[PDB]
Amino acid sequence: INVGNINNDKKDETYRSLFQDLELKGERRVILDCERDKVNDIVDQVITIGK
Amino acid sequence: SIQIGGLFPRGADQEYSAFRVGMVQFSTSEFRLTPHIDNLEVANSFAVTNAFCSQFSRGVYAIFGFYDKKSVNTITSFCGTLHVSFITPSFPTDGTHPFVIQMRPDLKGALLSLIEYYQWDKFAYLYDSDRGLSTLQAVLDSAAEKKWQVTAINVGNINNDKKDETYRSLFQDLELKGERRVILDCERDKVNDIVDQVITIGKHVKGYHYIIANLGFTDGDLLKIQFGGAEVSGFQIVDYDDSLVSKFIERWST
Amino acid sequence: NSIQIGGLFPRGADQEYSAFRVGMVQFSTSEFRLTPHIDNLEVANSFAVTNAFCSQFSRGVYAIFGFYDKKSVNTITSFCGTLHVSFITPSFPTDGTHPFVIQMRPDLKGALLSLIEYYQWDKFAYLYDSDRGLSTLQAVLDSAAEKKWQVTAINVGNIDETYRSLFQDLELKGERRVILDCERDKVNDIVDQVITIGKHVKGYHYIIANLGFTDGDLLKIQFGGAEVSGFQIVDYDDSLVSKFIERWSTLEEKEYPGAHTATIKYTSALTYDAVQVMTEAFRNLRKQRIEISRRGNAGDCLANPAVPWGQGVEIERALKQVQVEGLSGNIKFDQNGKRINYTINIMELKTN
Amino acid sequence: GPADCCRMKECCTDRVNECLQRYSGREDKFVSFCYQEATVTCGSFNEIVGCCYGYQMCMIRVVKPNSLSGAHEACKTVSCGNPCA
Amino acid sequence: GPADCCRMKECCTDRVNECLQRYSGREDKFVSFCYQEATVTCGSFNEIVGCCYGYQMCMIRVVKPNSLSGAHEACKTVSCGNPCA
Numbered sequence A: 001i002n003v004g005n006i007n008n009d010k011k012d013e014t015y016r017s018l019f020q021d022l023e024l025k026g027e028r029r030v031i032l033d034c035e036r037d038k039v040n041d042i043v044d045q046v047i048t049i050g051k
Numbered sequence B: 001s002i003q004i005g006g007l008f009p010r011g012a013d014q015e016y017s018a019f020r021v022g023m024v025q026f027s028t029s030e031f032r033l034t035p036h037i038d039n040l041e042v043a044n045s046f047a048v049t050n051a052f053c054s055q056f057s058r059g060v061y062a063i064f065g066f067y068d069k070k071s072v073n074t075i076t077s078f079c080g081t082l083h084v085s086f087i088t089p090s091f092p093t094d095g096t097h098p099f100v101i102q103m104r105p106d107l108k109g110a111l112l113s114l115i116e117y118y119q120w121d122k123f124a125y126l127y128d129s130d131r132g133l134s135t136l137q138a139v140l141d142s143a144a145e146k147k148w149q150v151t152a153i154n155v156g157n158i159n160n161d162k163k164d165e166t167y168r169s170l171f172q173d174l175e176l177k178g179e180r181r182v183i184l185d186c187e188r189d190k191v192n193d194i195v196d197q198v199i200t201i202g203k204h205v206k207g208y209h210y211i212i213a214n215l216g217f218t219d220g221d222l223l224k225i226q227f228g229g230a231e232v233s234g235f236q237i238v239d240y241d242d243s244l245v246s247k248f249i250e251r252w253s254t
Numbered sequence C: 001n002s003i004q005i006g007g008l009f010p011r012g013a014d015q016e017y018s019a020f021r022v023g024m025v026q027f028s029t030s031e032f033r034l035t036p037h038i039d040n041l042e043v044a045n046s047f048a049v050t051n052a053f054c055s056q057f058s059r060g061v062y063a064i065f066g067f068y069d070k071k072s073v074n075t076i077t078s079f080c081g082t083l084h085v086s087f088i089t090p091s092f093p094t095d096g097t098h099p100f101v102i103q104m105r106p107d108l109k110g111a112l113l114s115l116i117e118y119y120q121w122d123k124f125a126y127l128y129d130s131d132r133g134l135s136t137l138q139a140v141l142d143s144a145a146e147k148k149w150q151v152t153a154i155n156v157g158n159i160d161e162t163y164r165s166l167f168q169d170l171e172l173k174g175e176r177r178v179i180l181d182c183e184r185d186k187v188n189d190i191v192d193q194v195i196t197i198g199k200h201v202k203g204y205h206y207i208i209a210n211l212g213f214t215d216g217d218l219l220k221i222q223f224g225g226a227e228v229s230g231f232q233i234v235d236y237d238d239s240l241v242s243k244f245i246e247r248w249s250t251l252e253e254k255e256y257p258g259a260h261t262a263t264i265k266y267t268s269a270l271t272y273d274a275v276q277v278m279t280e281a282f283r284n285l286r287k288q289r290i291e292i293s294r295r296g297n298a299g300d301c302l303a304n305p306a307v308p309w310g311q312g313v314e315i316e317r318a319l320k321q322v323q324v325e326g327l328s329g330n331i332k333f334d335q336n337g338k339r340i341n342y343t344i345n346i347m348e349l350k351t352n
Numbered sequence D, E: 001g002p003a004d005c006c007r008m009k010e011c012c013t014d015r016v017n018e019c020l021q022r023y024s025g026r027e028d029k030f031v032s033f034c035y036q037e038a039t040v041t042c043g044s045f046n047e048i049v050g051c052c053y054g055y056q057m058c059m060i061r062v063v064k065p066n067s068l069s070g071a072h073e074a075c076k077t078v079s080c081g082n083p084c085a
C-alpha cells in the first residue's frame, strides 16, 4: 500500500479506512517504509484507533 | 442602577466572558446591574473573607462568585450572618445553607442512576479533592447497599511533576484487578490528563467502559478517545439542540 | 518582659479551659507569665471564628491557642498563614502543609492501619462522620485499595432504623469487625443503638479510633461480650501523669469545673501540654537573647494588603523547636507543625 | 441453555470466595462447604467433581484463618483439571 | 500435568483462527478441518467433542468467504457447550 499519495486534507479518514481493511485482512504485523514524518503520522493514527 | 458583587477566581476567563455577555444581553432600560468584580485566589479563605467584606462595605445588594472546598464555609457563614445573597456555579453544599443560591444542579442521583443503568456490580472510582468527597461518599453508601465493589483512588494528591508514572502504575494495578469499568470524577483538566494516559497505555480499546462524572462531557476534548473502541458515557447540562442555546452559540461563536 | 496570648474556648469546653488554667498556674516562670485573653464562641461558625481571631490579632497578641471545626479550620489556617500568627490547638490534625499552626494532637492513621493489620482484618466495616474530616477515610480507602481490603464506608453523621438495617446486612454478610471513627458523643450513640438491638453479641470486634478510649465511659459494652480495641494518648501510670492526677483530683469544683474526676479527656490533657509548649517556647525566646516585643500595632486584620509582623515568624520557629515531656508523652514537632516522635498506646477492653 | 466451562469457572471461584467471607477467621475449615455452595450455585458438569476441582483443592490446601484474600487471589488462576471425571 | 477447560478453550479458538487465516476465500469450507487441528493441538476432554464444540458450530454457521475476522471475533465468546458428552 502506497501511503505517500494520501491527501493531507483527507488523510485521517483515509487512514481509518485503510486500517479497517487491514483489520478485515487480519493483519497485525505491519512494516512502515516511510520518512520519519510519515511514520509519525501513521503511528499517531495507529494509536488513535487503538491498534 | 443596581450594584452586585463579582467575585472571580484567578484564571476564570470564559466564565467572566459569559458574565459580561449575560450583562449585555439581560440589561434592560428599567435598570442595569453594576458589577464590581474581584479577582482573587478563591482557595484562600483569608482572601475570600477580605474580598467579601470589601464588597459588603461598598454596600453591594447581592454577590455572584465561586468557592473552593476551603473557602465555602467562609462564604456560607458570612452570607448567612450578614444576610447577603450569594449566587454561584460552584458545587452544591452538603447541607442547607441560607442566603446561597447554587446554580449547579445536583449530580449524585444522575450518576448513581447511570451506574444502575449499565448494571455495574464491580468498578473503579477515581476522585480527588476539589469537588469534594461528597459524590464519593454517596457512591460508597449506595455501593454498600447495592453490593457494588468500588475501588476508591485519589488522583488529586498527585503532583504535576510525577503524574504520568503514577497514572501508568495505578492503571497497571487496575488492569491486574481486571477492572474495565471506571468512573472519572474530576474537573475537565484532570479528565483530559487521565484520558491521555489511558490512550497512551491503550486502555481506550474495546472492552473498556468509562464514565465521566463531569456535567459538561462535551466541554472537554474527547475526539482523541472517540475512535479507541471503548464505551464512554457522560452527563450534559447544556443541550446544544435547544433554540436558545443554538442562537446563543450563534452569537457566542462569532 | 511580659507575654500576652489569646485563647478560644468553645461553649462547653469547661474541663478543657480548667486544665488550661491549671497549666497556666503549674507552668510559671517569674521572669514572665502568659496573659490569657479568653474568648468563648461557637467554633463551628466560620464568621464567629474570623471575628474572634481578628479581635485577638488587633489586640496585639503574640500567639493564639484555640480549637477549630471542619468548617472554621480553613479560616484559621488561612488567616494564621496570612497574618503570620501562631496557633496552638488540640483539634484534629490538618491534611496538608499549614504554616504557623502547631497541632498538639498526634496523627492516628498509622496506629489505626497497623492495628488493622495486627488483627489481620481482610474485610471490615467503617463508620465515620464529617466532624474531624475525611483524611482518615482517604487513608483507609487507599490502604484498602493497595492491600485488597473489602472495607465498607458508611457516613453515620448524616442520619435509628437505618442502623438496624446496616447491622442486619452486616450480620447476613457476616462482617463482625467494625471501626467506629466518630465523636465521643456519636460513639456513645452508636454503641447505645448497638446494645438496644443486641449487635454487641459475641463474635463482634469494634475498633474505636480516637485518643479518648479510656477518657470516655466504657462501662456499657464492658459486659457486652464483644471484643473492643482502642487508642490511648495519656498513660495514667506515668509519674508525671500520676502526680498530675494527684493534684487534679484534689481540686475544688468551685474554682475549676470537672477537675475532681480521676481521669481527664485527651483534648484537655493536650490543652495542658499546649500551655507547657508555649511556656518553654517563649522561654527559649527570651533565653536566646531575641526580643519578641511587638514593633507596631497589629492593626486591622482585613487591611489590604496584609500586614504580618516579621519577627512573629521567630515565634513560630520557637514553638516548632520545642521538645518537652508532658501528659501526652514526648512532644516534638516537624517543620510543618505536626507532632513527631509520639507514642500511642494500644488498648483493649477485657472483663477486668 | 448454553453452559460454558470458563464462565462456570469464574462463577465458581467467585462464589467460593464470596462464601468464605461469611466464615472469616474460620475459613480453613469451611473451604469444602463453600466449594459445594459454589458448585450448587454455578452448576457443574459432574455433580461429584464440582465447578472447579483444582481450585477447591488448592484452596483447601492453602487457606488459613484470616488468610482468605491472598489465598483466593493465588488459587483462582489455577487449572480446574478435568470437569468430567 | 493438569489441563484447564478454560485455557483449553482460549487455545482452541486461537488455534482455529490461526489455521483459518491460512486458507482464504474457502474458509467456510475448511472451518471444521481447522477445528480438528485446534482439537488435536490444544487437546480435548473428549476426542469426539473437541476443544470447544459450540465455537466450531458457531463458526460453521457463520463464516463466509473472506468473512473470517468478524466471524471469529463474534464466535470466540460463545459457550463451549460441554467437553464431556
Ligand SMILES: *[C@@H]1O[C@H](CO)[C@@H](O)[C@H](O)[C@H]1NC(C)=O
Residues within 6 Å of the ligand: C340, C341
Ligand atoms: C523521631 O521521629 C523521626 C521522624 O520519623 C524518626 O526518624 C525518629 O526515629 C524518631 N525517634 C524515635 C525515638 O522514635
